[PDB]
UniProtKB/Swiss-Prot annotation, chain A:
Oligomer and partners: Part of the 30S ribosomal subunit. Contacts proteins S9 and S11. Cross-links to IF3 and the P and E site tRNAs.
Transmembrane segments annotated in the record for this chain: none
Record lineage: Bacteria, Pseudomonadati, Pseudomonadota, Gammaproteobacteria, Enterobacterales
Domain of life: Bacteria
Function: One of the primary rRNA binding proteins, it binds directly to 16S rRNA where it nucleates assembly of the head domain of the 30S subunit. Is located at the subunit interface close to the decoding center, where it has been shown to contact mRNA. Has been shown to contact tRNA in both the P and E sites; it probably blocks exit of the E site tRNA.
Keyword rRNA-binding found: yes
Name recorded for this polypeptide: Small ribosomal subunit protein uS7
UniProtKB/Swiss-Prot annotation, chain C:
Name used for this protein in its record: Small ribosomal subunit protein bS21
Annotated GO CC locations: cytoplasm; cytosol; cytosolic small ribosomal subunit
Pfam families, per the entry: Ribosomal_S21
InterPro entries xref list: Ribosomal_bS21, Ribosomal_bS21_CS, Ribosomal_bS21_sf
Family listed: Belongs to the bacterial ribosomal protein bS21 family.
PANTHER family for this protein: MITOCHONDRIAL 28S RIBOSOMAL PROTEIN S21, SMALL RIBOSOMAL SUBUNIT PROTEIN BS21
RNA sequence: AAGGCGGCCCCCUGGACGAAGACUGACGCUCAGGUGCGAAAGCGUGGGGAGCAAACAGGAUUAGAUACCCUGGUAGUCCACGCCGUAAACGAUGUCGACUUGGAGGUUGUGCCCUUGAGGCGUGGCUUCCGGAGCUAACGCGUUAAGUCGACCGCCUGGGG
């Protein structure tokens, strides 16, 4: 806002694995305010990923994050006739909460059979450095570098 | 202080270049009076002294020739 | 502003020394002035309007010196 | 070829572009690189970064001449006026002097008119 | 004197200012009509033409764009000699006098001591800024008055036409 400095609120850690980062993932996933269905979607999907690829479900979910987390993005600034982007580094809290949004929107597009399927796949490709989430991260990184002489 | 040529009450001369080189910069431009403190009556003679030494090649016009 | 680098040192002091050499020489303060032609009446008006403003701040300093704000 | 030992780096910066040329001490040029052809056509060829990449390109195509020490000679007051020297330092050359050869007239020809 | 005057050197020349003395002895001030000088643009006859650049041509923005912006570009700007005789030619303030509290400066002579080294003491000529009394419609001016007075000249008499 104009003057206020805002302290954020801690959300309840997830019931199963006791990690607030997971508990934030379901909150972004949840649509229309219903955690019961959303928690089922993530829990079944995470179980699917963990069974197929490796152990330590927390690390299994984490590996996708380090492949989608952005580093620098562009914010538009206007001076005269035309406005041009300016690169700027991204704070760590934004990086964690920007990646989950990219994954979720990517999942909602895949034409799989059910939401538990699409989320399961999207985390799988991201853990292998592939998929719509990673390309969207790449588009930001390529555009922040296509024009970066501005500062 | 600012008294250098006030003791030497003459006309500032052009064959004495050891005096002159302290009133020019590294590039060869003339230092303004506001820095050296020389008064107006002796700055004009000093300015003419340089331009008489510049023509006779005793002093450089510019830094790079 | 010809500068010859000295014995060793890193690149920066000689580089930053070069910039300080040009600032004293005022090379950039001249090229921008001669980039376009200003009419001799604008030449005199600009010089005077700078001087009278320079003096006005000089007298206004003593006015604020004598007064207190709180 | 001809394995010239020490050369000169002429930088013709300007308000709208930047041209970098590396010659021998006799004045015979070797190779050049500009921000315009470096891939910044438009409103970008006049930034310190675009000058930096231009100097980096000029450090190439002179490998066949084996330049090692440079006499950087700046000209043409513009944006890419200093950032293109430190880029030459990134190229590995050890420069030995820096000069500002900018043509200053002693009130010569009348300049163009002012812009409205 | 006003217009105006800017690298360096020479040879022709005008006007200011100061010190201390001599000389002439009212020889003065203003000035209708006249006479002279008078930026830039412009004109005539010869030269010169680098850079700028009216007109002109193309590109762009625009509803249009005979403009602003970009790319080129002729007269002109330069020299010699003649015309023109006008400008917001403006401190928008005619010239010459005497008088009327003060500060901060600049520039240029000087006569003393204290040539005690820097320094202090006084007297003239121009010029910048701030301000007291006074002035006035107010802004403001204010020892260089728009203050208090003389001497001559020029001009003003509702707006448009
Ligand atoms: Mg131009
Ligand atoms: Mg008359
Ligand atoms: Mg003319
Ligand atoms: Mg003519
Ligand atoms: Mg002709
Ligand atoms: Mg034009
Ligand atoms: Mg008239
Ligand atoms: Mg005038
Ligand atoms: Mg009048
Ligand atoms: Mg006053």
């Amino acid at each position: 806002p104009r003057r206020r400095v805002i302290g954020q609120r801690k959300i309840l850690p997830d019931p199963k694995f006791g990690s607030e980062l997971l508990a934030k993932f379901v909150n972004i996933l949840m649509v229309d305010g219903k955690k019961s269905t959303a928690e089922s979607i993530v829990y079944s999907a995470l179980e699917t990923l963990a069974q197929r690829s490796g152990k330590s479900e927390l690390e299994a979910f984490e590996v996708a994050l380090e492949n989608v987390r952005p580093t620098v993005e562009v914010k538009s600034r206007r001076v005269g006739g035309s406005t041009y982007q300016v690169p700027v580094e991204v704070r760590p809290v934004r990086r964690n909460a920007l990646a989950m949004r990219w994954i979720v929107e990517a999942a909602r597009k895949r034409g799989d059979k059910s939401m538990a399927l699409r989320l399961a796949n999207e985390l799988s490709d991201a853990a292998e450095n592939k998929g719509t989430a990673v390309k969207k991260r790449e588009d930001v990184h390529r555009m922040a570098e296509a024009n970066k002489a501005f500062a | 202080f600012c008294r250098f040529t006030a003791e030497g009450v003459q006309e500032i001369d052009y064959k004495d270049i050891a005096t002159l080189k302290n009133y020019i910069t590294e590039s060869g431009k003339i230092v303004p009076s506001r820095i050296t403190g020389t008064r107006a009556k002796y700055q004009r003679q000093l300015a003419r002294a340089i331009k008489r030494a510049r023509y006779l090649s005793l002093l450089p016009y510019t830094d790079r020739h | 502003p010809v500068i010859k680098v000295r014995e060793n040192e890193p690149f920066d002091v000689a580089l930053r020394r070069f910039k300080r050499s040009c600032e004293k020489a005022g090379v950039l303060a001249e090229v921008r002035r001669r980039e376009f032609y200003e009419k001799p009446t604008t030449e005199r008006k600009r010089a005077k309007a700078s001087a009278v403003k320079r003096h006005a701040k000089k007298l206004a300093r003593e006015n604020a010196r004598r007064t207190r704000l709180y | 070829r001809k394995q010239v030992s020490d050369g000169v780096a002429h930088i013709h910066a300007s308000f709208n572009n930047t041209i970098v040329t590396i010659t021998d001490r006799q004045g015979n040029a070797l190779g050049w690189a500009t921000a315009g052809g470096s891939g910044f056509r438009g409103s970008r060829k006049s930034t310190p970064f675009a000058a930096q990449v231009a100097a980096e390109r000029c450090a190439d195509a002179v490998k066949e001449y084996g330049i090692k020490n440079l006499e950087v000679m700046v000209k043409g007051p513009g944006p890419g006026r200093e950032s293109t020297i430190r880029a030459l330092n990134a190229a590995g050359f050890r420069i030995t002097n820096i000069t500002d050869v900018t043509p200053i007239p002693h009130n010569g020809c009348r300049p163009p008119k002012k812009r409205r």
